[PDB]
Structure formats: C-alpha cells, structure tokens
Amino acid sequence: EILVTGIKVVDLLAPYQRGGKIGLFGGAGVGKTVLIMELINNVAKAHGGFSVFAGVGERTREGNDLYREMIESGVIKLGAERGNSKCTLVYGQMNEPPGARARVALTGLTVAEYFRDIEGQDVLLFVDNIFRFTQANSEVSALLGRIPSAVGYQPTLATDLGGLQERITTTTKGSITSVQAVYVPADDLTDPAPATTFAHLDATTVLSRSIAELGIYPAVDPLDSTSRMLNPNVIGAEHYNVARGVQKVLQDYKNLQDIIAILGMDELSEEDKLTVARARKIQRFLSQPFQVAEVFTGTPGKYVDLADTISGFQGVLTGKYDDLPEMAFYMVGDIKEVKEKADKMAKDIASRKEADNKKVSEELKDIPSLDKLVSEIKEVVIEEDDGLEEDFKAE
Amino acid sequence: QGVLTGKYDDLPEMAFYMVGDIKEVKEKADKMAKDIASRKEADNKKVSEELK
Amino acid sequence: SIAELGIYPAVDPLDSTSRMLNPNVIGAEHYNVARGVQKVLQDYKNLQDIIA
Amino acid sequence: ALTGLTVAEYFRDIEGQDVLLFVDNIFRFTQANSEVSALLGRIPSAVGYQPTLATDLGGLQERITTTTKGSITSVQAVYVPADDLTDPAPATTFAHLDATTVLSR
Amino acid sequence: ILGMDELSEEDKLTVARARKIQRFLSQPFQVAEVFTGTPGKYVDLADTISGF
Amino acid sequence: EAAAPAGPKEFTEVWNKKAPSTLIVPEFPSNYTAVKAVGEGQVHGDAFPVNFYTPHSILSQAQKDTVVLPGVDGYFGVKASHVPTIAQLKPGVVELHSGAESEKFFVSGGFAFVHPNGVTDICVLEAATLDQVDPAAVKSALAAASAAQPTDEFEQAANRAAIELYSALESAVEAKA
Amino acid sequence: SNQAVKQRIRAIKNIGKITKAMKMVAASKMKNAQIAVEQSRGLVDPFVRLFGDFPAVNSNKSVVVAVTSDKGLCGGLNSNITKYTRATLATTESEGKDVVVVSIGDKGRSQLTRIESQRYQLAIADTYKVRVTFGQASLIVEELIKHNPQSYQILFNKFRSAISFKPTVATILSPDLLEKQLEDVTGNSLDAYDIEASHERSDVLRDLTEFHLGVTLYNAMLENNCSEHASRMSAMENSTKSAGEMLGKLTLDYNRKRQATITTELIEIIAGASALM
Amino acid sequence: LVPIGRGQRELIIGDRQTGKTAVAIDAIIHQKNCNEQVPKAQRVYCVYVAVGQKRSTVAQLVKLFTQTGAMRYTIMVSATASDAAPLQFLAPYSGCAMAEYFRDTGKHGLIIYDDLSKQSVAYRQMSLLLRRPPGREAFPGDVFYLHSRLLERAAKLSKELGGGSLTAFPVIETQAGDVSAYIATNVISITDGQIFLETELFYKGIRPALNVGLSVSRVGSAAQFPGMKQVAGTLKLELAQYREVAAFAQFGSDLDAATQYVLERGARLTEMLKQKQFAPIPIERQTVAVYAATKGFLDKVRVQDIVAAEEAVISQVNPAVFKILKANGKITPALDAHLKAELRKVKLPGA
Amino acid sequence: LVPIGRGQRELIIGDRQTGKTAVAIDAIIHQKNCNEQVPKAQRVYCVYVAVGQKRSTVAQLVKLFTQTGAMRYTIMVSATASDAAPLQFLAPYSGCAMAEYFRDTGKHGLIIYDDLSKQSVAYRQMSLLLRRPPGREAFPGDVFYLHSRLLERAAKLSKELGGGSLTAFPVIETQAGDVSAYIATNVISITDGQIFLETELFYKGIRPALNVGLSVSRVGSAAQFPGMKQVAGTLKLELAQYREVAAFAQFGSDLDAATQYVLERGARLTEMLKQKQFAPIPIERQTVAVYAATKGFLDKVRVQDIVAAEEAVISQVNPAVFKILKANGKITPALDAHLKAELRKVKLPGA
Amino acid sequence: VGLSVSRVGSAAQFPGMKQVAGTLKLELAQYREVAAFAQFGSDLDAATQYVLERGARLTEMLKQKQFAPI
Ligand SMILES: Nc1ncnc2c1ncn2[C@@H]1O[C@H](COP(=O)(O)OP(=O)(O)OP(=O)(O)O)[C@@H](O)[C@H]1O
Ligand SMILES: Nc1ncnc2c1ncn2[C@@H]1O[C@H](COP(=O)(O)OP(=O)(O)OP(=O)(O)O)[C@@H](O)[C@H]1O
Ligand SMILES: Nc1ncnc2c1ncn2[C@@H]1O[C@H](COP(=O)(O)OP(=O)(O)O)[C@@H](O)[C@H]1O
C-alpha cells in the first residue's frame, strides 16, 4: 500500500510502501535529516498509531530540537497527560562511546517491537543515521582481535546489519513503517556500509550533493532512488507511466551533459534541445519547499497530493507547459502554483513605479529628533573588569 | 599488399568482412553488386503468393 | 574493442608482436606489407579522435 | 638533513648570524624517513608514507626559525610526486613553506 | 592569433611596459662572472622598489 | 501616392509591435553608407566623385574630372555637375582621367549612375585593365563566335552577347598608346 | 572504473586541442575572408542611395532569404538569425500576404522548417565549398526570379567586427511591381534621372533589380561566411576553456583515485601480512 | 540475442535495481508456462536460491510463485540476511544438491543462485573470523574455487547417465558498473555467457536493461531456437550497426539517408526488445514478433508505439501459426509466405 | 550571510592559505572590542587551540593578541608541529576543558580548534603506531568519534544549568577544493553550519572568500541581529541572483539590461562584503553599510570605490544612528526614515 | 622526444652534433605541440604548415632499422 508523503519526487518516482523499509541515503549535509523531519511532520501526525524515534549517533542539538518541537506540538505531553503522547525518543547520540551507539538502534527496535508484537498496531520507526550503528561496530571490532575486512570495516558487517534490519518488519500481527537515514561516507555509494544497507530496503531515496549544489531541495537523485512500489500493478498505470517518462527524460538529459558542457546548447538538434528544456523544467519541478525548512528559507511548506503531482508531471511530459519559464517551476507545490508564480514573475518583471511614492520627508508626528531617540536609550553598566577572580574564589 | 598500394580501392569496404583471400572479396563485392539491384521488384509479381 | 566491431578473430594488430617479424626471417615483402598495415592502422587510430 | 641543521644551528645559536640552510629535495628526506619507518615495521599511512610524516617534517622544519640570537632561513628544493599537489608529502611540506620560487624553462 | 595591429593602443602600451618589466627582472650574478665575464650586481631593495 | 512611407526608421516601430523585446532591431545597409543622393554636396568644384566597383575587387573610390563611359548608344561623358543618368553600359573601355594621364579598363557591361549630388557609380561585373587582356585570343574566339549560327533564341542571344563583346575587344588593344 | 578516468582524461585532452586547432583554422579563414568582404561591401552603396531601403511595404507576395552556415560549429550564429527571420517575418505579414521562405545553408534548412515548413520552398547548400563568386549568387538570384514577388527579404550576419555580427536585413523591391510604385512622391522620385538605356524605364529597372538582388545576395553570403568563421573562432575558444576546466576536474579526480588505490592496496597487503605475523 | 541452452551457466550481472531478479523470475515463470505443453521428459523443475536477501523479499517471491502456479515445480532455498554466515555460505550448495537430483534422474533443472556476491561476502566473513589470511578486497585465496566448484555442477549429462541437465543462473551485483572487481571477474571467467544489465539503459526505458554489446552466450546459436535463429543473427547485426552509428545522433541536421535508415531501424529494434516484467512471452510469439521487425513490416510505425504495435501484431495474426511454429521448430517455407501475408491484414498503431 | 549563534559549532573549512585563521582571529578580536561595551554577564572569553602549527606562527599570533589587547580574554593552547602526536591529539581536549570552565558557570566561551585536520593526522599517527587497523585514507575507524566527542561539548546550556554557552570554530584544510574528503565530511556532519572559503574568490581579491552558495548556518537565522535579519534578506537574494547570472552569462554572449542590472548590483554587493584583515566591524556599522548597499544608496558608485565609499558612509553618517540601532536592535520604522534621509546627505566619491 | 631527457646531455656530446642538435631540438619542440592540432592538412597557416612539414621531415630522418648502428 502506498504512503502519500506530500513530497513530489518521493511520491512520484520512489513511492514509500506503507509498512516497508525506507532508506534516505546521502552524505554530509545533503538534507537527510530535513527530509526525515518533513517525513515525521507529514506522515507521523496523520498516522493514527505510535511513533518511535531512535537517534543513533547524531547531533544532540538535533535531539533537543526534536524533543522541544514535539513538546510544543502535542506529540509529546509532559506530566499528567503523558498517556496522550504518541512518540518515544531513544537517544544514543554522537557524544556517546561506541558501545552505546552500536546498541541504541536495538533499543529503538525493542520499544517498537513491543508495540508491533504485543500491542499489535501500526508504528512508525524513524532512525537517524543507521550508519552510526555500523561505524560504531567498526570502532569496537578494531579492538576485539579481528582481521579487518574491506575498506577498513569489520568482517561481520553484513550479518550484524542483517541481525538488526531483519527485525524491522511488518508481520501478520503488526506493522512497522521504518524510515532510516543512511550516511554515505565521503559521498561514496560503493562504500560497503551503504552498499550493504541498499539490499535491506523497499524504497530507496538517494540524496545527491550536486543536486543540492544546484539549489534543488530535496536533492533526491531521481535516477538513483528506486522503489519496490514502482510497478503498474501496485500504483496504477498512469502514475507508473509518468514516473517512467520523467525518468526517461532525465536520463536523456544526463547523457547530453558532456556535449552540453564542451559545445553548449547551440549544437543539439531540435528534438534534443526540446528535451533539454523539458528536463530542466522537470528538474526544478522536483524541488519543493518543506514545512520544516521554512525556518531558514521563509517559503512556507507545500503538501502536494498524489493526484496533483501525477497530473502536474503528466502536463510537463506532454508539452502543455513549454511557454512557462524555468524558475516558475522552482520551489512550488503543484501545477497551479507554477502558473501563478509565472504570472507573478512576469508581473514582477513589469512592476515599475515612477518617483517611488516616498512620503518620507517631513513626517508630522512620526519621526522625533534623533536626540529624543537617544534619550530613550537606557544605559547599561560596565561591571568592573569581568569580576572573574572573586566568583572563582567562592569555591 | 593490394589494398595497401590501392589495387582494390574500387571495391566496397564491407566486401572484405569475413572473406578468405583477395579473390573471395571480389566475388563478395560482385554478390553485393548483384543484390543491391535485387531489391527493386521482389514483392508480389506472382512471386510471393498463397497458391504457388 | 575489435569484438565490439564484430570482427573475428579479435586480434589487436597494434598489440600483437613476434620475434618472427624481422625482415631477416620472413623477407622484405612480408615485413613491409605487415609494417604498411600497422602504419595505416595507427594512422586510423590517430584520426578516429577527429572523425568522431 | 639534521646534520646540516646542526651545522647551521651553531651559526645561529653561538655565532649569532643569519644562515642559509639549503636542503636539496626535502622529498628525499620524506622518503628516506618513510624507508626507515617501514624498516622498523611501522604500518604506513595514506599513499605509502610513514605514520609519523607530519611529525618528522615538523621535527626538521621547526628548528628553522628565528631565535633571539640569529636565524636560519632555509631554501628547500621541492619535488612533487606524479605532479600531485595533493600528495601527502607536498601537502605536508607546503604547510611549512613561506614562499615558493618557481623556476621555469 | 590575429596580429600585433589588432590590439588597442593602451594594450600595446602594456605590452611595452611588461616586455621591459620582464627584462628588468633579469640580473647578472657575481657567481656567474667567472664564466660569463660580465660582473654581478647586488641590487638593494629600495632601488628595486623605486625602479619598478 | 503617399499612403505607405516605408523605410529604415519606421521599420523599428512596426517591428517592436509584434516581436520579442529581447532582440534589437535588425540593422540596415544604408546605416553604413556615408553618401546619399538627395543630400546636397559632394561636388566641390572640378574634381567630381567617381565610384568604380566590381564584385571581386574595388578599383576606384577617389575623384576624377572627366570620365567616358561605354554606353549602349555611344561613349558618352560625365563632367563635374552632371545630369542624373541611369546609364546602362555596353561592353567597352572605361576612361578615367585625373589630368594628363588616363587609367583605362575594359569593362564588360554594367550600369553607372549619376545622382543629384554629382557622384557617379560605375558598377560592372568583370573589369579588365587593357594591360591585363591577352591581345592574341581576341580573334580565335571571335571567328568561332561569328561562325556559330545556332537554332535557339537563347544560344543566339549568347552568340550576340559574345560577338558584341569581342568586337569591342578588337579595338581595346589596337589604338591604345 | 579506474581505467575509465585515465582514458577519459586523454579523450578530453585531445578534444581540447582538436577544438583549438579548429579555432585557429577559423581564424586563418577569417583573415583571408576579411579582405574579400571589404572588396565586396561597396557595391551595395549605390543601389541603396538609388533604390532606398523599403522593408515595411504593402507587398502581396514576398520572398525571404536567411543566409546561414553550412558546417555546424558556429555557436550562436544560425539560430540568432533564425530568431531574426522569425520576428521579421512576424512584421511584414500584416494584411494576409504570401511570404516565401528561402534559406542558404545546411544549418538553415534544418532550422527553418521548425517554424515555417508549409511556407518553406527553397533550400540552398554547399555554397562555401571552395569560395563565393558572383556566378552562384546570380544563379540563386535567378532561382528567386523563378518566383515573382513584390519584394525580397535578405537576412545575414554582417561582419562589423570580429565580435559583433549585426543581423542586417536587406529589402529588395521588385522593379515595376513595387519599386516605382513606392517612389511616386509628388510626381515620381526616380524621374530626376535620365535613362540612357536601349529600352524604356521599366526594362532597365528590371535589369537593375535583378543585378541589385544578385549583388546584395553575394554580399550577404560573403558577410555571413566571414561572420561564420569569426563565430566558430569564438565558439571554439569558449569550448577549449570548457574542455580545459573539465580536464582540470578529471585530473584532480584521477589523483584522488590514484592515492585511494595505493592506500587500499597497501592496507590489504598490511592486513594480509599481519594475519600471519 | 543471448540464447541459453539446457546445461550451461549464464551469469546475470549488473548494478542494483536493474532487472536481475526480474530476469530470473521471468525464467522460472516461463518454465511453468512451458512445462504444461511438453511431455514429462522435457519439464524443467526450477530451484531458487536466495542468499542474503530479506525475508520479505523471499515472501514476495513465494507469493508470486504461488500466484502464478510455479511453486509446484520450484524449490525455494533461502538463507536470508539474519541467518548466520555459514548458512549463507552453504545455501547455494544446498540448492545445487537439490537441483542435482533432477539432473541425475534424467530430468532438467534450473538453479538460480541469487546474489552469489552475498555468498562470497558470507564466506569472507566466515574465513576472516577463522584467522585465514585475507587477500584482494579481504577475500580469501579460495574464493575462485568457492564459485567454480559450485558452478561446474551445472552440467548436461551424457545419454549413459540419463541425459539430464542443469542450467545455472548466478546473479552478481556490481558497484557502478565495475566488472573489474574481484568476484565479478571470477564468476565472469567461470560461467559461459553473461547477461550484463545496465542502469543507464534501465532508465532510458529499455527494460529488460540488457547491454547487447557486452551480453554474450558462448554456446552461440547451437542451442538457439531455429526460426528465432533465422532472424536473430540479423537482429545482432542490425543492433551492432545501430550501436556504431550512435554517438553521432546529436547532429540532427546531418541528413545522410545512408545512416538514418539504420538509425531508425535500430530504434525500432531497441523498442522491440522492451518487455514488461512478470509476463514472459512464449518463444513462438517472440520469433513471430522479431520476424515482424527484422523485415521492415513496422517501418511505418512511430518509435513511441511499437510496444503496442507488437501486441497488436501478436493479437491480430491467426492463433493457428504459433501452433505450427511451436511444432515445426523452424520458419518453414510453407509458413514464411503465409505469415508474410498474415502480417499484411493486421492493422497497426502507426501512420 | 552565515550568522552564528552562541552555542553553535561552525566549521571554517577551506583550502590552504584562503584565510580561515583570519576569520577566527577577527572573531576573537571582535569579542575583545565587544566585551567592553556589554555587561559582565554577556562576555565571550575566547580560546585558540593551535594544533600542528608552526611555533613561529603561534608566536606572531600571541604578539597580535597582546598588541590588540585580546589576550585579556584569550587562552592559547599551542601544540605545534614539533610536539609529539599525543600532545596534538590532546590539545583540543585541553582547550575545550578550559572553555567548558566558562560554559559551565554561566559565562560564554568561544573556541577555535585551528586545523582539526592536523589533530586527525596526529591521531592517525597514534593509531597506526598502536598497530590498529586503518580505514579510509588509513584513518582509524574512530576518527569520527575523536571529533564528535570534542565538538559535542560546544553547547548552549539550559536555565537549570547556568545558561552558559560554548561556541566552537573547527578549522579544516581541504586539498584542491575537495570538500568530500574523509575528515572534511566527518566534521561537516558534526558541526551545525559550514563556512566554505573558496580559493578562487581569494585569488581574485575577494577576501573573506566566502562561497555564498555552499556556506550555510541553518541554526543562526533564528539567532542573528534583527536589523541584519531584515536587511540581509535581499542581500542573500541578490547575491543568489548574481551567482546564477554569473553562472549562465559568463561567455559575454547576451546583455539584457535587467540581468546586467543584477550583475552590476552583485558586483557592488561583493565589493561591499570585502574586508581588510585584523579590523572587525561592530554589527550596527555592518548593517548600516549593508542597508546602504542594498537600498540603492551606493548605486552609480563605480566598482573600484565601494571599499572607499563604505568608509565614507560610516564616517559621514550621524553616530546617533549607530547608537540607536545598537540599543534597540532593530531598524525601527522611525529610524529608517531618519536613516535613508541621512544616507542621501553623504559625500560619496565619484558622484 | 618530449618525455625523454638526459640531464647531462646539455653539452656532453659530439660537437659536430651540437652544431645541429639545438636546431633539431627546437624544430621538434615547435612540432610536438602543433602535430596534435592539425591532423588535417587542408587549411593551415603559413607559419604552421612549415613546422608541420619540417617536423615530419625530421622525424622520419630520426628513425633507423634494427641491428645497424650508424
Ligand atoms: N522489464 C521490466 N519492466 C518493468 N519494470 C521492471 C523490469 N525489470 C525490472 N523492473 C523493476 O525494476 C526494479 C528492479 O528490481 P530488481 O528485481 O532488478 O532487483 P535486482 O537488481 O535484481 O536486485 P536488488 O533487489 O538488489 O536491486 C523492480 O522494482 C522491478 O519491478
Ligand atoms: N580578509 C582578508 N583580507 C586581506 N587579506 C587576507 C584576509 N584574510 C587573509 N588574508 C591573507 O591571506 C594570507 C593567509 O591568511 P591566513 O593565515 O588566514 O590563511 P590560513 O587559512 O591560515 O592558511 P594556512 O592554514 O595555510 O596558514 C595572509 O597573508 C593574509 O594576509
Ligand atoms: N528542503 C530543504 N530546503 C532548504 N534547505 C535544505 C533542505 N534540506 C536540506 N537543506 C540544507 O541542508 C542542511 C542540513 O542538512 P541535514 O538535513 O542536516 O543533512 P545531514 O543530516 O546529512 O547533515 C541545512 O542547513 C539546509 O541548508
């Protein structure tokens, strides 16, 4: 069953299975915590069941921010109404020694597995950097008297990861929907610790760095993020057809990048410089402003329905939007907002005013004298040279 | 030596594909210069009917 | 690479050597034909970067 | 190289002059320390240099300073392996250099 | 690629300035006067700054 | 008679009413021409401006005082402040004078215009100087040209254009000293 | 994988000199085209001080020529004047007139059927194989005399400098169909000239308009040939920079992969030797 | 293009999410389809060995092999990821010993070792913890012998031993198309062919994502279906021409008409070999639909609807030809002129 | 552009000689200048840890911090290149203990681990001399834990714990802009922001050479100066537009007189964001200058005068503007009606 | 010629070879950087066609058969 997440590229090209495992790959600041927070915000509040956040080896500031954000949002209630809470946080963050980070994912799984097996209900299990479990076992295993495997890891990498990951499943008595961010080290998808984790997931969401350097957020690599749901007997026929058409247009653009690099767009044929324009349009249309990213971008977040993104990408695949500019597609929710932003961005190229309507000179009882304003400044005191000796000598 | 000096530069380039010696490439070029003209009238002409 | 062209036996003519390619063991006619073939093939490999 | 440093350090510390210590191919100092580190059975680092690469270069180059008595000013010829300016021996050596005098043909 | 008459007048002036900068960076050396004959010159710093 | 004044200045407004605004106006070859016809001047006395062009070469731009042009009715002359003439030229010799000397090209047929500002503009395709014509093949082509009496009006027009050229090529080599 | 980058480096390294060779070839072609364009610019002056410049006429039939390039390495030449012959062919048709599309060049017939195919009639190629002369320009002028419009349109990149290629329009009015009709300004502006020709004014105007179209077409395909060589010189300078910057990226990636290869092989040897000792 | 005989070993090599398990599943489902139209001496009883996958993937595959009906011929050996490394080491030998029962009794088998690379990873763990000295990529010395002594048990036995067979389909996952890796070179050199799948052709719409230039089968046309063999060598040749006319198709102005015909014909042939997953077509409909495209019957059809044109050709010709091409075993001359003309009265989605 | 809060971890990552130490030095010197103008409760005491540096450069730096008067608030924990590798491994922890003193008792601390890349080199030496198995770039597996254990101690403590804070500035030296190395991507996934200093902006005179598109601080926008929060929004917007038009119009191809407008606007904002070394600017004098450059009062000033015209703006504006903006902390709707008026009456060069 | 050096070969050879070896070194160093350019010999400058003929004249002079040292 599909999980509508309200993100365009995720719901279109690699749709999450309700109950499946989800992996968010990407390395060192591409957005695999902002994406997992927006997944928490979209799926988790409209879920119905419980949530379990297992932070494994990530920032303690992030755990404090998540804890206070869930307190301010009613997902976590303190004290007398604590039974109404719907999230358990389990934290083995990156200041903990390697014995603790290697075993806190198992604590998160045990708190989730009591809900799945005994309580018998749907839960959501978000894990922040399941890579830190593998890396912590690599730090431990260097001292346990073992011969090291390939690039420096433990020999029991696949079996430790399989012992952890095979417990995160849906059974006939309950359901764990698991999203796990997976750090790739030094931007290498062929590193053995992500390349083993690839085989344990239904839906994969590979966040790339170059797509983030293009400004496109979420920086999902659309030809590297796959799913077991992208199948016409599962998601319907027209969703699957527009997904394959989007991926074909992006792949045809990707094969042209070296000749566009040296020879420019003035060398391609008409059929190629059409697909360059359409693929640059659908590159921008995969971007979307998140609700949790609005604190540092300003643009409010967009929940995009599945029908909205299927129809919106069907339009740009057919050719119904060839006369809109590229930056109309940048950071918009659905196909109405790109047209609204296009009409607004050709209004804003014609928004010209003459003599710029100041009314700034001689404002009758708006501005005081400057000395009246400096009179409003209360004066702070300078408290005698840091006083550091005496309040150290209190001890 | 013949294709080096230019003795057989008037043959097609694909007559040389999978032939033994310099005579069989000539016969394959002659077979090609037959069969380029065979695809002119080779459809019906009571030649590919259902009753022959 | 030559097998990608379908050509069989896929022997590389600019990498296959012998000590029997001296003109003192096969004669000047065989050595000069083989060196002419190697020269025209190396000319072609040095022009493929332009004709591509 | 430490012998050349010591003959220079006598002029700096006792005579109190300004010395020009010329170290021809600091890279061969690096690779000779790499050889004598591998011969003592130490596990080599990245590309094949010793684990104590930065400290061996530091223990050489940190005596080429200006004291209150005099100064050693060193002119070190630098070889770059495989024309790689990110190779660990020039990447560790360029952290000590104050000037490069690139001579060209 | 085009010619010495193609560039500007002030760019021709900077060509003159730079081509006499490149000569003035040169210097005879006192260690070379044994095998070149021309004597060497220790140029002071203030003379270099005031010359350039 | 004056209900459509087209031109280079008026082309810009009718262009901008229905063009994309990014493109500047398509330029005009009259914007690179310095001497007009209805503009008074470019006479200044005795030396009048000539313009003897060919496609493959420009052979004159400067001033002359008397030029003789091999027209279709006879080798007429143009002096300083002349009558405006749309003059078609027959194959013949042009004569350009600046004084006692004379530079003489055998032209091969092309118009020459005197304007209401005193300029003349001799526009001929192939202009041969008399010292570059071979005076030996002037009869070997002419004999075969006068002998070739064809059956078609196109080829006999070609033969007529041949023989009127060759007959002028006779006296272009004889009486020049 | 490590063999892909070292071969790709040699690929980009030969591309970056192939395009620089074609750049200097384009410069040496521009250097001899520069004297031919200055020998052939001057013949458009007497006709435009004689026939004027009448682009926006009431033509019932019109013919447009877009003078484009043959080879395909120009870099913003054939598609610029494609947009100019789009926007200019937006402008002439304002009363439901016929306009015939002609283009000169292999990159023009492949760039003008995209916008105007039913209005396309004629395509000319192979024009700059050896050089340009008045013969072939007069011949394609005759092929436009196979049509009989009221006016002719020319589009070509005029070689102003080696950097500026002004897309110049040349409008050639049909003589007794439109030219004397556009000159009837308080009488007729052409009647100040005295006809020396063998026949009447209409026939010398016919020969004159044929010669004027032929010489502006010769000038167009010489201006455009020289600006083609200049644009290929500019576009294979920007391309050498791109294939030098991609080579600068690929050498750095090769050196990262080289150092990582030596570290990986070394770590494997050390782990295998320490498993025994 | 890459025909497979009963008794050889065909590697399926590619990157992740390219079609490897899909090709193996289509093979097992088509063995179920062929097992009902043949006598009991021709039936192929498949064995699926799943080493290192999740149990959810194995549950999806057992659900699929039950839904299609292929479970009554299939054995499913699953040492999964939570299972111990000696179980993932000894799972392909278990499944090969189960398939050797059908090989040794005159019947035919189809063993598919899914992710033989994960067997090599489990063996690497099991040998590194036994303090055996590692080698390249920390693999042991005998990891060539590990896969060779497993794959050489897939044999076509002689007539004095029952004449049975065993076809092996090892699946190898590579990292970014790198076949210069250790286990990849080992099992490439061990097996007969290779079905090399690419992820850059998987996203160009060409699915199953077979890189035709590198995918070979070293039995050749010795165990190709005749009739399919009569068009298949020309199919290889025309795709070989289309591949060497490529990397020039960025010049759409370059009107040649000597290369554009093969550049269009190769596009129709590339569009021909696309196929949905979980639906294997019988061999007679396949050779009819390749006889439809190698002759130029689809040359009018646009390249964007040949995947419907092939279904219309198969569904609009008579269902009486496939019955006699399945029995007659080659395109007989009493069939090539019948179905020359039966492909004229079919209507096409292309004009 | 990348504003920094108290309790943050901000990585100053760059290449060799691109001015990372200069950013850290200006931060420390600015904390000296700002400590005398605040109450005792909000005063930042700095620590400079010098790991793997030359002793001469630390000697010049101590000379600079004493001749500024910044050594009154600074601790210097110097482990030079001659010192043994456990000392360079331990000196970030000694410095972080010395600044955790100030964090724990309600005071505020700043710490600069200068070249944590050299601390990781020292720890790689310690690990390989302990015969420990190495990994990526021959680093031990716990070289991430080395840096995360250290950088997690930079915190903003609660009201129950004193309220003190510790702000860390790790410096990381990349090689050729290789921001995807092992230690660089380790510290990128620990710290809150990133200050990426490009070498090519540095070699074009643009110093501090801030890569504006890559350097971020998603934790600071909530914690910056409220005048600069509303002034520098159009600064980062116009700098993004300047970067994209100087990413597309680099060839000198087409001019539009609107993209040329944002070109000559970003070419003035970039000249405004230049800064001389060792001379920090108080934040109100910063935001008045950024106001004057984004509200168009430095328009028509030539692109070689804004480093003089900004001194003209700062010298010729009434100082009550800076006092009011510092005290209120926001450009009040009365204060900008003062401020644009007093910005028009400024003798700008060129005119 | 480009990658083969001899760092004593600056004046350690036959003097009669030194009369011509500097001209041979420069006339090939002029050729190695432009031979990669114009594999085509169609449209060549007068300053580059002389180097692309002289380099080919000197390169085929500098080859010799085996077992026959001069
Ligand atoms: N011919 C095809 N047509 C349509 N979809 C296909 C085709 N082949 C594969 N797919 C889809 O592509 C995805 C590829 O998964 P696949 O079965 O290839 O895994 P694999 O590469 O064998 O191994 P892994 O599971 O490790 O990726 C599947 O979701 C499958 O449904
Ligand atoms: N803002 C600036 N304005 C002008 N010059 C600067 C600026 N910042 C740095 N520089 C110059 O850059 C040079 C190197 O600066 P700095 O010492 O800060 O680099 P660094 O990053 O420490 O390099 P390294 O780590 O290799 O020593 C110095 O000489 C300094 O004068
Ligand atoms: N949807 C988004 N919109 C805007 N910026 C984003 C988005 N996602 C990520 N970022 C950028 O990524 C940074 C955070 O990366 P993060 O999510 O922590 O990845 P990681 O956990 O891999 O470090 C933020 O500073 C922000 O600038």
Ligand SMILES: [Mg+2]
């Ligand atoms: Mg994170």
Ligand SMILES: [Mg+2]
């Ligand atoms: Mg699979």
Ligand SMILES: [Mg+2]
């Ligand atoms: Mg520094």
